[PDB]
Amino acid sequence: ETSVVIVGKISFCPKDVLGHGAEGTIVYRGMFDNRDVAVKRILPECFSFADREVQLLRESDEHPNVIRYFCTEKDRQFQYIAIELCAATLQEYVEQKDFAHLGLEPITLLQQTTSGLAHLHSLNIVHRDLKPHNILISMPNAHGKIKAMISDFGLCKKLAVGRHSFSRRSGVPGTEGWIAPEMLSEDCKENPTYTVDIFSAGCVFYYVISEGSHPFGKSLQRQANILLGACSLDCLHPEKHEDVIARELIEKMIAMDPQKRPSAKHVLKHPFFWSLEKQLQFFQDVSDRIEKESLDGPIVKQLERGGRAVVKMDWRENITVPLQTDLRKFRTYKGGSVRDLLRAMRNKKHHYRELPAEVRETLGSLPDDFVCYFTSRFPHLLAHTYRAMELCSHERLFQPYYFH
Amino acid sequence: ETSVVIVGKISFCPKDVLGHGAEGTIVYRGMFDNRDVAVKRILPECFSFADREVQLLRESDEHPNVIRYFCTEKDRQFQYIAIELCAATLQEYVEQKDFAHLGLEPITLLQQTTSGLAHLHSLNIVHRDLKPHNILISMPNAHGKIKAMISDFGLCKKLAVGRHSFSRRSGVPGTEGWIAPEMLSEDCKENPTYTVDIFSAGCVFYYVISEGSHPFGKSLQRQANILLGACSLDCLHPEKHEDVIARELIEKMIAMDPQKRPSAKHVLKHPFFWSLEKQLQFFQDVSDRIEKESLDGPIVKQLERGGRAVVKMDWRENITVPLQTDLRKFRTYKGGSVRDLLRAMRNKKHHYRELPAEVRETLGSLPDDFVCYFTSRFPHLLAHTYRAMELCSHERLFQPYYFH
Ligand SMILES: N[C@H]1CC[C@H](Nc2ncnc3c(C(=O)Nc4c(Cl)ccc(NS(=O)(=O)c5cc(F)ccc5F)c4F)csc23)CC1
Ligand SMILES: N[C@H]1CC[C@H](Nc2ncnc3c(C(=O)Nc4c(Cl)ccc(NS(=O)(=O)c5cc(F)ccc5F)c4F)csc23)CC1
């Protein structure tokens, strides 16, 4: 005994409220062409912007991590925008989940969000209101997989061709606690640009992997801390390898200097998104790259700068006893050298199949267990090597690992 | 002074005809929700077919290489189906002289098509009408890039739950030339299955890379030769590396025994689609795997079976003089051995940075010219090594290269 509203090909039940937007807009569950949709109702004072918004998303190239638009209808009083129906917000995903049964789904979710953002930016569109509440989680497809989608383009700006920045004349679009600091600065000479989205995404990254925390604290003091640069990444412990890599990326995404934030396409290349196999492949390509480099050369000096803390003074003392026994039968590696620890890894990896069964047992299978054997014992190895080998980042061998 | 037809939210100008077909079929250029679309008009004698097939298109169309459906309108006389407006068919792409590829070359097109096909089969949808006329080429996107899309879903069937097969009662295309033989024979025990699409795809593959030829002849003799098993791949040359690899894949796709045809996901794993760098990596992983292998073990024995033709009696005599001069130090490399050829390749890849400038100059840069140096001189090496190392296809290191 429920009621239906039909405006053209868009139908919805007024009792199925999914949320409330800005300016007294309501979102309903509904139907369009017998597809499940979400239906946003807007006011007459919004008809000009909605047509501009719809024209933006109807005309832009489709992308799997940008929400799919279906149809707009107008009646005597309202406009209605139908889009793909989603199961949840990213906010509800983080509140209502336990990241043990998910595995790499949180990181895949952030990589999809970042792909969507890189797609917007390459169309010269700055979102300016990225936040967990308007990153949407799809309904499971026929195979049960889900994905993240960027939505809510009311605050976005399409830069003119040739422009790389926009002026603050419109003021401060955004939501308190996710606004880049250069947006709220009286004495900032440089116009904001695409990197306002990187700062917001950085906060989202930390929000997801911390399962609810914000780099700049609780919501009431959140935006004040941003202006002061008062951030804190406590949930990332500095001696767990996964947390070190995540901290290296996020710190740059939320950096106070906008020009120090990586573009969205840079973010996607970071080791935060590397599989175990690719990390070991990076260690191998590095070890091969520096095998004939002199100890006085710029590449090795960079790699050894701070190296004793990376290898924990003597890495041969921080490995398992069967691998210590096996390393002594051969030429001696220098225990304080990052380069030699990489050389030992490359050598045990290349000769894995002929290693004594005791040594293959403590290393574990190639490549997953093998690489974690080293990264879990030397949690700064990959981050430190990644930063040091930035010198070779324009060479063909290191193209899969960096971005130009 | 041109006339406009409006049927619901679909409109079109009947002067803008795009094609004709059976059952009084006409396709027009038109509009829907202010997008350019193609509009197909069908008769009352198709209302029954049409709705079932529109639903299957609506369940498949989220994949980027499946045509996107937009709207369907029922008319007091006809039915009208609006889909994404496209620029060309695959047929026009192959047969038109200076067809701008727009950053889309034949291999990427075939891989896009197979990706779409694999998406369908994973939804338990068999297409059953795959041919160049109903693979479409998109309009360029905002970045100027184009892609291929499967369409013409009028004959596609969703298999019943638990069936891997369908019966020949209701869904064989009226236009022949591209139909798997078991769809049209009578002496047939097994019922047709997904591999009817692979057979058609096999013919399309040849049609694209041969630039217009069919494996089974021209027009009317095609389907007759298909039922006969009389095919010919003579555009694929036996002494060109790309053609040898292409022939090894197309041959299994159009195989008479439907059970011997690889699935669409298996096709995608075939070296036909490997980048140059992946091919060089396969050679290195093989060479490492057999370095300590017994000369009389099954693996090396398998690798040397027919090795003389692969290395052309003496591979040391079929390489450039600078590389010959550089291999002189390695007197352990036997020129009659496929394994030793692989060992020399791996050794010069590993030590590439240290090689003299003469040697690097004839090899070319790593990894593209380097791997082509050898495959262009030993056009059977990859195909032979690939088949030979199938003995190691269940080992973790050779997971990426095979299909399990
Ligand atoms: N508890 C859960 C919570 C999640 C619920 N599922 C949802 N599924 C899908 N959408 C939503 C929403 C929601 O606001 N949609 C929405 C809608 Cl309908 C229209 C416009 C915009 N913005 S736009 O920029 O104008 C815009 C214009 C375009 F032409 C295309 C895309 C656009 F974005 C928008 F963002 C709120 S919830 C929810 C299910 C119940
Ligand atoms: N020289 C160039 C040539 C390419 C032209 N561009 C095109 N762009 C986009 N579509 C086309 C087409 C074209 O047939 N569309 C089309 C359309 Cl509109 C609707 C349906 C189907 N499928 S179906 O099997 O009929 C079919 C039947 C059912 F009952 C149910 C579902 C179905 F799916 C289809 F396939 C023909 S040309 C062209 C531009 C000029």
Curated annotation (Swiss-Prot), chains A, B:
Q: How does it assemble?
A: Monomer. Homodimer; disulfide-linked; homodimerization takes place in response to endoplasmic reticulum stress and promotes activation of the kinase and endoribonuclease activities. Dimer formation is driven by hydrophobic interactions within the N-terminal luminal domains and stabilized by disulfide bridges. Interacts (via the luminal region) with DNAJB9/ERdj4; interaction takes place in unstressed cells and promotes recruitment of HSPA5/BiP.
**Name of the protein this chain belongs to:** Serine/threonine-protein kinase/endoribonuclease IRE1
Q: Site annotation (Interacts with hydroxy-aryl-aldehyde inhibitors): which residues?
A: 333
| Native species | Homo sapiens
Record-annotated KEN domain positions? 276-404
Per UniProt, where does ATP bind? 18-26, 40, 84-86, 131-134, 152
UniProt topological domain (Cytoplasmic) ranges: 1-404
Role description: Serine/threonine-protein kinase and endoribonuclease that acts as a key sensor for the endoplasmic reticulum unfolded protein response (UPR). In unstressed cells, the endoplasmic reticulum luminal domain is maintained in its inactive monomeric state by binding to the endoplasmic reticulum chaperone HSPA5/BiP. Accumulation of misfolded proteins in the endoplasmic reticulum causes release of HSPA5/BiP, allowing the luminal domain to homodimerize, promoting autophosphorylation of the kinase domain and subsequent activation of the endoribonuclease activity.
User: In which family does this protein belong, per the annotation?
Assistant: Belongs to the protein kinase superfamily. Ser/Thr protein kinase family.
Expression by tissue: Ubiquitously expressed. High levels observed in pancreatic tissue.
Q: Which residues carry this modification: Phosphoserine?
A: 165, 170
* Gene name as annotated: ERN1
Chain segments annotated as coiled-coil in the UniProt record:
none
Q: Where in the numbering of this chain does the Protein kinase domain appear?
A: 12-273
Region span, Interacts with hydroxy-aryl-aldehyde inhibitors = 347-348
Cell location = Endoplasmic reticulum membrane
Q: Could you describe the post-translational modifications of this protein?
A: Autophosphorylated following homodimerization. Autophosphorylation promotes activation of the endoribonuclease domain. In response to ER stress, phosphorylated at Ser-165, Ser-170 and possibly Ser-167; phosphorylation promotes oligomerization and endoribonuclease activity. Dephosphorylated at Ser-165, Ser-170 and possibly Ser-167 by RPAP2 to abort failed ER-stress adaptation and trigger apoptosis. Phosphorylated at Ser-165; in response to the ER stressor tunicamycin.
